[PDB]
Amino acid sequence: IPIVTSPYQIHFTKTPKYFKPGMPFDLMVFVTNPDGSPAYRVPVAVQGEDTVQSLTQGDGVAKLSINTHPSQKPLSITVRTKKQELSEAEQATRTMQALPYSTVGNSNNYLHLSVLRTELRPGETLNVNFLLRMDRAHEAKIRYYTYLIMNKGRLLKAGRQVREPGQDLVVLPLSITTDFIPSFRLVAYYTLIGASGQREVVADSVWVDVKDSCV
Amino acid sequence: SPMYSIITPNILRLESEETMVLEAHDAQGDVPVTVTVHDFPGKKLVLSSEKTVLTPATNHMGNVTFTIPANREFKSEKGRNKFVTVQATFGTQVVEKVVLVSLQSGYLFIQTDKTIYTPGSTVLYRIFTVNHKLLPVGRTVMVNIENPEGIPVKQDSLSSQNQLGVLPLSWDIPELVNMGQWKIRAYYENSPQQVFSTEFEVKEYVLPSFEVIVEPTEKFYYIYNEKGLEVTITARFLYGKKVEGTAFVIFGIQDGEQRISLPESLKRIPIEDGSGEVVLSRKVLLDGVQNPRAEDLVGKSLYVSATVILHSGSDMVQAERSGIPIVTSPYQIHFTKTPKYFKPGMPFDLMVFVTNPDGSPAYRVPVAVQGEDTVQSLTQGDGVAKLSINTHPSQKPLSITVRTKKQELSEAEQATRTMQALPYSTVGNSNNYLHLSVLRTELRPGETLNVNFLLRMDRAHEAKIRYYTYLIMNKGRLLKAGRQVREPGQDLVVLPLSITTDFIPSFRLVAYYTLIGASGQREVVADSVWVDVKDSCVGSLVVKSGQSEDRQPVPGQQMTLKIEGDHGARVVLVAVDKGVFVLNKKNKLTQSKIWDVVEKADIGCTPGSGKDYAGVFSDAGLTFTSSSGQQTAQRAELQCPQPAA
Amino acid sequence: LAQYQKDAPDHQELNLDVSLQLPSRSSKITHRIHWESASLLRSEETKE
Amino acid sequence: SITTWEILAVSMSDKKGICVADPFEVTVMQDFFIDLRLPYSVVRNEQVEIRAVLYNYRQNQELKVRVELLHNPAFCSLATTKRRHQQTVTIPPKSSLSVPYVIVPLKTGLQEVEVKAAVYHHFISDGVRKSLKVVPEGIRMNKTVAVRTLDPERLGREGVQKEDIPPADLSDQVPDTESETRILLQGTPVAQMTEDAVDAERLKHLIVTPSGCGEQNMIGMTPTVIAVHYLDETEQWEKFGLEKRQGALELIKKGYTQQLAFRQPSSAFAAFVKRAPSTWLTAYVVKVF
Ligand SMILES: *[C@@H]1O[C@H](CO)[C@@H](O[C@@H]2O[C@H](CO)[C@@H](O)[C@H](O)[C@H]2NC(C)=O)[C@H](O)[C@H]1NC(C)=O
Ligand SMILES: *[C@@H]1O[C@H](CO)[C@@H](O[C@@H]2O[C@H](CO)[C@@H](O)[C@H](O)[C@H]2NC(C)=O)[C@H](O)[C@H]1NC(C)=O
Ligand SMILES: *[C@@H]1O[C@H](CO)[C@@H](O[C@@H]2O[C@H](CO)[C@@H](O)[C@H](O)[C@H]2NC(C)=O)[C@H](O)[C@H]1NC(C)=O
């Protein structure tokens, strides 16, 4: 039975440590009870502005997101609970610092992945969003993304998602089956020849969790 | 010069709070704004209150409120449309817009102790008086009781002020009475044209001691089923024990409002272990009708009438199941939750509503787009499936067809639906769009919702878009509005939105940006989407037993009734024998039917999007007007334009 | 044409004052029939 | 009453609004009991059968029951004060048994019937006392006395009308039974006497901007002023356009502004301030204003 000052314990273990400068960044905050059990419906907030809050989901994860500026400087991240009636001294907090994504030669050509955060059950569909970020002089050369699915130490699924000029954001419906249990990573990349005739490869990845059940 | 803007709903209501949103775009320094409401036509002046200052610190924002009164002068015209025009003064530049007025003032719900009564007995009834916000209001209500042919026999007039919006009343039925359907009709004093009603039955009856349930295996009939319609009989006493007896069951066909009976479909089965089963074969059906075509049977409906008597011979109950459709498909697909306007050159979301033939939502049926078999999705719990396409910059309408892919079922059994979407028209065909994308789940209060804003324009003007302007429409009024700032290079921004009890049952999110583009021309681009919220109470009222043991109490015994609920609320109770509902369970009021009436009073007519920025707001239920000249389309009808169907 | 409308002529001129003399005769039931009550139903019940 | 009660509760909160709770069910029951199932009504002085149902829900025990119909001064049967009408029956376990009785109603009204039963070797008993309506022979009739038209201007002459309603003769009325006289009045809705108005299709052209001299300003102001007044009384702004009245208000207000520039210092009007004042034009503006 722990002896602590705060009825909660916040962890960035499930939070990505690298943000995209000038691009929105998602924060997956893992809030737990002192023993290690997930906390339910505790409102945590970003250090900047008390208005940006969110209540923890059923699995002990809270969803927050920021809109990063094109700053190449690391971004300080601090999350703090705002549970009512409890004093500020009782509110848990955790602090980390994220690092910026580095493009090929700092060309400022990025790929951004964004995915829904909910208790995912096999048999439902998931919309994967692919966002291209680059100067539009080279946007016509990106006609597709190439994605792969890693699950349980092996490649489960892979394919192409076509893209037309001017459509920086594309949506790919993905059906979740029992094979994606317990968790999987989605990697994606595009390629082109830019600058003065030089090969450029930009990549991105994201980790997804699946709800506990039998195959 | 900066552009001033006023945002108000399409239709304003009497005797209710009306949100007024004032904004200035690209403004510099402070600007005082005075508010005034005039009558229309003519000038008599109905309200002169309220003023505010749009501040660069507040991003030139300011929300103010007003309330439209009701007197003998307002309540004069009852049958035709009348309007009032609010004028807004931004410093010295005045902006004004004519607005539609609704003569409705709130809601009326009527509860009775029973659904069916005896001559010479007492009728107890309570009326809950709430405004459009479902909060207790104190107003004078006019109630009338009419006979089967519509003759008012008893009428009341009373104020619920200081009674917390509850009017408990009573009335005695004489023995000299015409049995049949009797209706209670009520309307507020300041809104005589908005009439509410609920019905009850008068009969010479005695309550039975057991219930009869007629359960079809499927709530529909597939024509080419060789076995025919299977209907399971279930019967039990009112206290929960199994019934032993013999049943006589008969079938029939319902065509429109006229019912045809099949005499030879009669069967006689004993009821054993509190249950029975009877099957109407396909051959008997074809023999019952004189039409040998099975195609003509599609679209008609069946009904079942059962007569059950105990093996003691002392009681008898008649039960009925009706409206069982005769269809080719066990499902019905609808684009009702899908927007009818797509963005050329941008991905578009499809919200497909698949239902069972009766009208109930279907669960976990896999539907797919007709074009390309790879895109499939299973329906969620509320009968909605998520599909999406990658649109080409085609200015030609795009045909969308969805077809279910449920296994084992034949292609003839697969439901399908076909529609054609329309392209969004930009200002001068500038091809500068706004795209909204939002998660699709059963939204419960206490969760956060991430709204995604995607900007589309040439990067020569992307630095000029420094903010978005968003508003939330819920239950015919503006609930929340604000700005979301944007820095250069951030075409996509995310805004977490927290869902509270106020967003029930559904809300629309509109958003827009503005700038001076093309060759020096003001441009306004808008987008919208309609979101559903899970049906539930605003608070939480729970009734349970205080005792934890001594199952099945004894008649007359004292027991403890435990009621858990929000602090400060007033609770009304009624305990009825379930036998009355076995005789008549119609007109039973519930929370879901309350949210059903609210949705039927919504002024929004489209699940978002639109032909242009003006159609976005006009379809959502908003009026927009600026100092520059851009304004919403004129609307003079309270109702929503009817689909072609 | 505006003066034709505005106070547009109409067929209603209802101004009926109707009263009843009851067998009990404790009071005389009296009602008025105007335009707003043109098609209004008035009903009364005696127990004899 | 032995049944499952459905308890409906609705809450009223000034902050959380109205809420209809889920119906709550309370199942009241007794292991052994009787159910006397009467008809809603019975005809006076005619023998009828009543059905009393006795329930035994033991899983392995059949019960020997003494069931008795008690004496009644309003009903005739074998039950008298000296002689009771009692039977001894046996009910198998998990079953029900009905014991019929024969009675005769003797007097009208909501009269009382009572039955009792007790089992041997267990001290478990039940009794049912219910009332049912004893109705004399006959049936309802809703005959009409008279239907007539009221017209004081036409009937009675000189704005006054008087008329009687004779009582119904109804020689077939059952003695000492209620009889209501239902009086209904309904006025005669008279409409029409209105001719069609101009549909405002081709009237959209009368929006003219005032300009020119004083009389020329009145020429441009003339059609715009009367048009808004015509559309107001015809309430045809739905077809014409609600936004166009606000635009016409600016032009009419603008015409009133330009008209005062040609006003003579003696409150007279002419084409110019140099021109002699026009008596006709002065009267025309008064008619317009
Ligand atoms: C890799 O190749 C295999 C070939 O075995 C692919 O599996 C087939 O996928 C198609 C999808 O159209 C199915 O219809 C076939 O039934 C599959 N093959 C078998 C043997 O079942 C697979 O899709 C390819 N890609 C990946 C990522 O595995
Ligand atoms: C006598 O009373 C009856 C009601 O008991 C009335 O007639 C009813 O009229 C309705 C139409 O509005 C029918 O649906 C019912 O079936 C009628 N009932 C009958 C015929 O018993 C009416 O007030 C009187 N009718 C007669 C025939 O005397
Ligand atoms: C409109 O203005 C009202 C001012 O009365 C705002 O209400 C206040 O909002 C702030 C921040 O949300 C709260 O801290 C205050 O407590 C609110 N006032 C009261 C009396 O409680 C309202 O939020 C504004 N709405 C919009 C959409 O701008």
Residue numbers in the entry:
A (entry chain G): 324 to 538
B (entry chain A): 1 to 645
C (entry chain B): 1257 to 1304
D (entry chain B): 776 to 1064
Excerpt from the paper describing this PDB structure:
The point of convergence is the cleavage of the 186 kDa complement component 3 (C3) generating the C3b fragment (178 kDa) which becomes covalently associated with the activator surface. The C3bBb complex is the AP C3 convertase, which catalyzes further C3 cleavage. In contrast, properdin (FP) is a direct positive regulator of the AP and stabilizes the convertase by associating with C3b in the convertase and proconvertase, reviewed. FP oligomerizes prior to secretion, and in plasma it is found in a mass distribution with roughly 25% tetramers, 50% trimers and 25% dimers.
